[PDB]
């Protein structure tokens, strides 16, 4: 449910001395930690983060001992991240002029996490290291370090200015040491868990997505009054909105308590009488008249139903259920009930039968007693890992629109010529967004839109952060990487340059 | 209004026996979900069914 992350950062003098073009590790590390803090602050997952620095002039640690455990300071303790951390990261943190042993940094991080995690159910425990591996050090305790890491089940990650994982011998020794630590803690899989600074930035440039949790909906799939399969339904795809809303606050006091909203009804007479809320009864319109219909009478006459129904009205061929008739604002995934082998077997039988026959199940769906009944389609979805039914709503007779449109094939004045058809063919060929894998196995998508985050939330979070930290300036423009992710690869445009010119030359487009 | 990615699927005119249109010609605009419009599902062991 919660994770404790200890950001160990090097502030040694070695990082400061670097080529300006290389973007010396100090700025990169500061930016990385800042971006991490933003992502955690604007994604309220109740994750605790602490900050420890090694390589600073001062010394403040729980353990002092002798000359060891020196030049290390715990700037922040475990707690919920907040704007103060961003402000401190931006300016409060400055480089030092000393050197420290990153092994001692790991020791102090272990001590801090172990001491502060008591009393809280932190399931995860991650420790991150930001060092140049260019400081002279001695290895004399790695065995006990690894033993403690294994016993406490603490994950460890490393970030270095370089990619491999043109360096000095000290850097090679540090690389060897980090490799041995990672191998001992995890193994072969741990080799790739070391992320350079640029690689980390490439992934931390986007605010975290809105991850809501879907609550399981239990019910019974019924085929007649004799067959019943216990099922659990989840919401797979739905349009996501902002969890929070703008709250209107007074212009000067900036308090929510200082404003009040209310509604009043007044008659249509000239005197503008006042009628209380209890004096109004709801009525409807029947042609040219108005029919009073009280709420109580409507409740008495309302359509009453027995809720929580997942019933199979029938089975129909897949061709008869078209994709352009789907309605609703959700897609449901129906699985077998948890911890029930029999239900799993029954549902698997139904799914396989439908798939073999190329059929779908037309079903009646009611979320609860007061939810309006729906008629929808459940069709199979079989994958290597799991198999489930997918439910999507279908239209009633009232929701169908009967519009007639003029034909285009038979129209005499709109028939394109052969040259126009060839030009459009060239345009379609040039602007293809999929590529075959050397005509060998399958297709590959060049612009996968399902994996692009929603730009609205990114824009909102950017503007909120900019208004919090800079409470006077205007809202910035739209970042360039948002536009880049909302546009296709430059190759498509490069290939499409000329076909569009041909299209412009052939089709006589004129604006009226 | 924030942009939404959509797909235009061509439609071919289809007429019934009585020569009455039942599928007009044009394009069908189908909305494409974003990354955050999906949700993660619990892991369930797959149990096969005998033929």
């Amino acid at each position: 449910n919660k994770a404790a992350v200890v950001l160990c950062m090097d502030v040694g003098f070695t990082m400061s001395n670097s080529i300006p073009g290389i973007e010396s590790p100090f700025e990169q590390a500061k930016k990385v930690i800042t971006m991490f803090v933003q992502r955690q602050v604007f994604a309220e997952n109740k994750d605790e983060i602490a900050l420890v620095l090694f390589g600073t002039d001062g010394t403040d640690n729980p353990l002092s001992g002798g000359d060891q455990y020196q030049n290390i300071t715990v700037h922040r303790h475990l707690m919920l991240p907040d704007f103060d951390l961003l402000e401190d990261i931006e300016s409060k943190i400055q480089p030092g002029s000393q050197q420290a042993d990153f092994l001692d940094a790991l020791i102090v991080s272990m001590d801090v996490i172990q001491h502060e995690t008591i009393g809280k159910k932190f399931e995860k425990r991650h420790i991150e290291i930001f060092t140049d591996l260019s400081s002279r050090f001695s290895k004399s305790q790695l065995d006990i370090i690894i033993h403690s890491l294994k016993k406490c089940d603490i994950s460890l990650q490393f970030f270095l200015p370089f990619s491999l994982g043109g360096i000095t011998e000290q850097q090679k020794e540090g690389l060897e040491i980090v490799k041995m630590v990672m191998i001992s803690l995890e193994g072969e899989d741990g080799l790739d868990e070391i992320y350079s600074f640029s690689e980390s930035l490439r992934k931390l440039c986007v605010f975290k997505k809105i991850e809501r949790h879907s609550i399981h909906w239990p019910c019974r799939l019924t085929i007649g009054s004799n067959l019943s399969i216990r099922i659990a339904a989840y919401k797979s795809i739905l349009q996501e909105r902002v969890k929070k809303t703008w709250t209107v606050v007074d212009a000067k006091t900036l308090k929510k308590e200082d404003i009040q909203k209310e509604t009043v009804y007044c008659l249509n007479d000239d005197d503008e009488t006042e009628v209380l809320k209890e004096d109004i009864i709801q009525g409807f319109r029947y042609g040219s008249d108005i029919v009073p219909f009280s709420k109580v009478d409507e409740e008495q006459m309302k359509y009453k139903s027995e809720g929580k129904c997942f019933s199979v009205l029938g089975f129909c061929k897949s061709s008869q259920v078209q994709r352009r008739f789907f309605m609703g604002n959700q897609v449901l995934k129906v699985f077998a009930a948890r911890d029930d082998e029999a239900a799993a077997v029954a549902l698997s039988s139904l799914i396989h039968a439908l798939d073999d026959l190329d059929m779908v199940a037309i079903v009646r769906y009611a979320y609860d007693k007061r939810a309006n009944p729906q008629v929808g389609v459940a069709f199979p979805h079989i994958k290597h890992n799991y198999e489930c039914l997918v439910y999507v709503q279908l239209p009633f007779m009232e929701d169908l629109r009967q519009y007639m449109f003029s034909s285009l094939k038979n129209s005499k004045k709109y028939a394109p010529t052969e040259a126009q058809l060839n030009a459009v063919d060239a345009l379609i060929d040039s602007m293809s967004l999929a590529k075959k894998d050397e005509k060998t196995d399958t297709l590959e998508d060049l612009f996968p839109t399902t994996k692009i985050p929603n730009p609205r939330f990114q824009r909102l979070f950017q503007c909120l952060l900019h208004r919090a930290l800079h409470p006077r300036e205007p809202l910035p423009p739209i970042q360039q990487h948002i536009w880049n992710m909302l546009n296709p690869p430059a190759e498509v445009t490069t290939k499409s340059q000329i076909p569009l010119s041909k299209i412009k030359t052939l089709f006589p487009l004129i604006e009226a | 209004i924030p942009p939404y990615f959509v797909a235009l699927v061509p439609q071919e005119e289809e007429l019934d026996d009585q020569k009455i249109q039942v599928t007009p010609p044009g394009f069908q605009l189908v909305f494409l979900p974003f990354a955050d419009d999906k949700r993660k599902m619990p892991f369930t062991e797959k149990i096969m069914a005998t033929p």
Binding site: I362, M397, L400 | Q18, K19, I20
Partner: peptide
């Protein structure tokens, strides 16, 4: 045009809702 409704001209006449009728 054949199938045009006698109540609302210009609209296709909807066949009555028959529900589920199982085939032979």
């Amino acid at each position: 045009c054949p199938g045009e409704s006698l109540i609302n001209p210009g609209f296709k006449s909807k066949k009555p809702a028959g529900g589920v009728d199982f085939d032979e």
